[PDB]
Sequence to fold (17 residues):
Amino acid sequence: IASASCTTXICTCSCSS
Fold:
């Protein structure tokens, strides 16, 4: 339901490092 970089269907995913 939340994270950064890490799912397929709601909206987060990734975006740095």
Summary: The CA atoms of residues 2 and 12 lie 7 Å apart.
